[PDB]
Amino acid sequence: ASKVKQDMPPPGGYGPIDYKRNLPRRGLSGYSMFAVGIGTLLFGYWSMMKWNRERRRLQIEDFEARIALMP
């Protein structure tokens, strides 16, 4: 009492197979990206402004010490 056994799909078939493209958006807006860039530029400019003014004062102090020693 043996029945035919063969490679067949299961009853009801197989599940759906995805084949469509699935490239998502996954990104901010151009406006927001440009805003972030401008903001970091401005923060950097402000920090460099203060630091370079301080460096100019330090250079003036060193030059004054040299002038005092020069004679």
């Binding site: 599940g15 197979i17 995805d18 084949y19 469509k20 493209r21 699935n22 490239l23």
Partner: protein, 54 residues
């Protein structure tokens, strides 16, 4: 079941890549009449725009 994701990852590296587009866009353009006369078949014809598939 697991192969569409591989195709998606392949497309993530090439389809919208500007370097890939610069290398492949407007390179080796063949007209439909020229393809038919030269005897091209398959993706050559279908890229030229001919609606033919055996």
């Amino acid at each position: 079941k697991n192969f569409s994701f591989r195709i998606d990852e392949l497309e993530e590296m090439l389809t919208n890549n500007r370097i890939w587009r610069n290398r492949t866009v407007d390179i080796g353009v063949v007209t439909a009449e020229d393809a038919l006369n030269y005897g091209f078949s398959g993706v050559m014809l279908r890229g030229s725009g001919i609606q033919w598939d055996l």
